[PDB]
Amino acid sequence: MTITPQNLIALLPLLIVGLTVVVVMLSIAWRRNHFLNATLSVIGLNAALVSLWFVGQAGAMDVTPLMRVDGFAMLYTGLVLLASLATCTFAYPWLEGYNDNKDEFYLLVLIAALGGILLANANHLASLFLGIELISLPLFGLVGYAFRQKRSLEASIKYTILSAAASSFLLFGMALVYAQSGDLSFVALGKNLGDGMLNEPLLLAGFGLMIVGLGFKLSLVPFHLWTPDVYQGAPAPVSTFLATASKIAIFGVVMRLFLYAPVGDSEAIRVVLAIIAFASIIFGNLMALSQTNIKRLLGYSSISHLGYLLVALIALQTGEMSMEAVGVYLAGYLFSSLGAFGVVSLMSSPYRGPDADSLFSYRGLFWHRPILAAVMTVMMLSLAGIPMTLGFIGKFYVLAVGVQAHLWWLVGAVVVGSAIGLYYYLRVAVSLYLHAPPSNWQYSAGGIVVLISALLVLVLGVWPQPLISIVRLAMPLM
């Protein structure tokens, strides 16, 4: 099978993102202009987002031995492109706080966006590997973008060493899986077995090593300890991108890998994934109890929400409802993290020196900056799965999927973790309103983005039918 102009049309966001990455690189080489480079990044990402329409008009196609494009890939492409656009929008005033060069940030942002597209359209072990590292490497760049800062350099070193080790683990597991199977496509990972002989120690150990690597990428326990350190160390737009786009992209490729492979029917993988989900939910919700820092609290929040997502993913083989639940909760998670980390980005922007403290001091935010406090408190209302918000719709979908396949331990863990999350989220929300002891249109653009996220959360919590409809329209190959 070769490449056709129809396949060229179906690859439009990847082509647009790569071409505009080359464009912004050549613009950096031509002249160090910040506004023009960030602007070209914005039209590049928006051009990919509107070429999604032409991809949808094209149709689902198996474009490569590697790539398969359908509604699943289109939806996750749209989510990661929205996250990249928001990351640029919040990164702009923080970069006018930056004394050093500010142009490589957006270049790394759309290279990581290209990696997200590659993971979204991934239907191959090679493409999955390349997407993981094409997401990871610009995050190594962006976490240590402010290398003069202590915490940014420390988090960059930690994330680089840990993600290279996890890439080594995932590569070795992929090599063992390929040694057993002899083909690297997702659909052929366990096709030679039959009559109940789907379990074999080499394939199981290979998939366990990929489970280790991917659970590092989704902060699953016990590969979760990097998350608060990296989230606090990295800049606030970098924290936004790592919380949104990376988590959506690797969880989408994990959903793809566990749906199109025949290894999902194996009970041992399901049991160990249930154990990982239980541990992730309980540990992530418990560790954010006495946290006085917003970034580490949101890191443990990311751990707990990826545990909920894994709980939804476990019941994929029995029920035909788990995939749309995963999509709905991923959309709600994207909007929630975008709003929350956007408030962190606006209250962190501009970059007021590396040696000066970057403490948040969220207490009493309403009395001087009321709109950002309103967005932050509705964001914590959304993160706890409280009604009139999209997080409740995601939690309801996860609970219904768990009830459908009779996974009661996960349901109890969800309830307990939701109670602890209620405690610390609403403690933050009330502390927003207590008694504590700009002037540019890009800061206004970031305020518009967080206000749009808050209004979307409220509207889709009150009326969740359009989101469910557009998620069910993303109907991939059964």
């Binding site: 070769t2 490449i3 080359v22 690189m25 050549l26 950096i28 080489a29 031509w30 160090r32």
Partner: protein, 129 residues
């Protein structure tokens, strides 16, 4: 076949006699000729006068960025090594893809040249004035 085994044996004997000749040459150099007994024999040569410190100090270098770019460009080079041996069977589609590859390489190199990378010369001379 017979010729493959003959060439493998010839290559093995080539390596064996090469290392044997080198080791015998070193042994003959080491064992023939008298030694020396001098006060300042075991001093590193710094043009007749003693050193200020040692030769094992922390030497700076300006070649770090060029070293990393060398490794990256050698990996792109190995990709082109894989391409070049099968150009005829790849067809024109492979030519277009390798043209995109080399265009990304050229854009990266122009980016390196223009931003001040690959330019580590001291600001005093720089072959100016």
């Amino acid at each position: 076949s017979t010729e493959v085994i003959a060439h493998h044996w010839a290559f093995a004997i080539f390596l064996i006699v090469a290392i044997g000749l080198c080791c015998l040459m070193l042994v003959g150099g080491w064992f023939l000729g008298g030694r020396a007994r001098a006060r300042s024999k075991n001093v590193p040569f710094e043009s007749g006068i003693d050193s200020v410190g040692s030769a094992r100090l922390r030497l700076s270098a300006k070649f770090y960025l060029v070293a990393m770019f060398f490794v990256i460009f050698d990996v792109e080079a190995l990709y082109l090594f894989a391409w070049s041996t099968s150009i005829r069977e790849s067809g024109w589609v492979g030519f277009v893809e390798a043209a995109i590859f080399i265009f990304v390489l050229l854009a990266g190199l122009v980016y390196l040249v223009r931003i001040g990378a690959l330019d580590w010369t001291p600001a005093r001379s720089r072959r100016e004035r």
